[model samples]
Target: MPPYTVVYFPVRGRCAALRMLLADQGQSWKEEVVTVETWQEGSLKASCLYGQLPKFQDGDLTLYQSNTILRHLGRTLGLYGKDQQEAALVDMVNDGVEDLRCKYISLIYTNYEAGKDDYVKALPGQLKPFETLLSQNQGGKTFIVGDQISFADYNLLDLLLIHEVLAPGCLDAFPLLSAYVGRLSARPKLKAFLASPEYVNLPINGNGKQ
Candidate 1:
């Protein structure tokens, strides 16, 4: 087994970005899946730093908070960026991803049916900044922060994908983002991982949507 272990619910939730990152980097890790029954059992939640499912363990060190783990892995895997400025830009891109993700989670778990229309209506506004950022760089033909891929790309890709599930053809409005998603997702390893049973079979959210 790998030294790193991720303890999360069976659904992708907050863990999907890191899962894709590890797979793309060819890194091995173990999954300690938590079922609804296991979650209700409660002991594990008590042990968690914030009563969250996506807890990560690295040897003797234990980490909570999904983005912290992603940043750590970014540093270790050289997915941060080429320079200090680029790293900061990558973090900026990731922060934007998180903002939209928080809103998406709220809608999915709260009142998806009631809010789905409004949410989809507002999605293009949220998504356009990313498209614009991409457009500014290499005429939208390249990565968000720099010429190379960064940790933010994985997170952004997952963000875009889940939104696609919630709102089909959302990306169609953003040609740059749509093409960028296709480009990154088509990478051989990520393509295989995305299609693999372990990923495809899991629900995108905890409430059985997507």
Candidate 2:
């Protein structure tokens, strides 16, 4: 065993990003799925680098932070950009995707009990920014930063796929985002995976399980 392991809660949360990166490369790794109850029992959060996941353990090295792990895997799998500057661009694009997600999570978690007022009211404003970014495809490149299969590309696509889950038909509201999502998602393995049992039973309109 190579000891490349990923630890995260059963829910999509942070791990999904790493999953996409791995799936893109078809890297064989160990996935440790734990329930919140199991996490609480083991007190794994206290043991984490930053008390968060999706965490990775590689031999003697353990890693936290999704983007950090992403860069690590990118380098290992040749998924990073062609040059240093392009790599920075990849990071920038991934950061943009993170920015939108952080805002969305903030609105929902802080306001779910209150109602959809904050979510609906804030979504249009928040979504439009990225809508423009994804629409034009910066630098006329097919992918985000690198012409290759960079993590930046997976970051946005996977995030959009999850958002489609966390909120029903959420991507439909943003045509650019949706179109780009569909574009990248057409990859052979990804397209097949989306229709697989794992995605079919997602907490959305189809299987409707939580």
Candidate 3:
């Protein structure tokens, strides 16, 4: 059996980045998918630490919160960074990704039709910081932080991909980000996972919005 198990709804949602991280690193995990009907049953929700899905189990240790899970995997899988400095930079990148993810979640769930126009209109400003971050290191030809792939790269990659789905051609204005997405997505293992039904068949969000 796989050492790790992820319990969550079928939608990609918060689980996508971690799944991508696991897949890209050639890690195998079991998926304990939850349906809306099952979640509505309340027993599972009551047991959850944060009353949320994406509950992850690694051996005897169980955890909630998507970013915490990502960080844990980053540490255990050596995807955190090379040293203290790089680790801090990794954290900084992940936090920025989270900030944008929050905005994305709000728009998708709360008022997509009403807010999408304004959100897309201001998206360039929100996305510019990441592009700038990439430019600072290695001329945007490599990963987000250090030379090797980090957990934040997986998170940021997922963020960029879903944004492309939400706003078609959104990355067109940012050449570095565009190339980054293409390059990362071309990784052999990750490419296979992305093409798999497990990822392709799932909706991006739970409510069937985007």
User: How much lDDT does each candidate structure score?
Assistant: 0.91, 0.69, 0.96
The number of clashing residue pairs in each candidate reads: 0, 0, 0
- How big is the positional error of residue 37 in model 2, measured in Å on the Cα after superposition? 2.1
TM-score of 3: 0.99
lDDT of 1: 0.91
Runs with alpha carbons beyond 4 Å of true place in candidate 2: 135-141, 165-175, 199-210
The TM-scores, one per candidate, come to 0.97, 0.81, 0.99
Better of 1 and 3 by lDDT: 3
Residue 52 displacement (Å), model 1 = 0.9
Q: Write the per-residue lDDT of candidate 3 for residues 72-141, one digit (tens) a residue.
A: 9999999988999999999999999999999999999998989999999999999999999989989999
Question: Which of the predicted structures, 1 or 2, would earn the higher lDDT when compared with the native?
Answer: 1
Which candidate has the top score in lDDT? 3
Clashing pairs in 3: none
* Order of the predicted models by TM-score, top scorer first: 3, 1, 2
Candidate 2: tens digits of C-alpha lDDT, residues 32-123:
87666777775888887787767888888888888888888888888888999888877878888899767656645554556555565665
Displacement of the residue 12 alpha carbon in candidate 1, Å: 1.0
Candidate 3 — worst ten consecutive residues by lDDT sum?
Answer: 128-137
- Model 3 lDDT at residue 180: 98
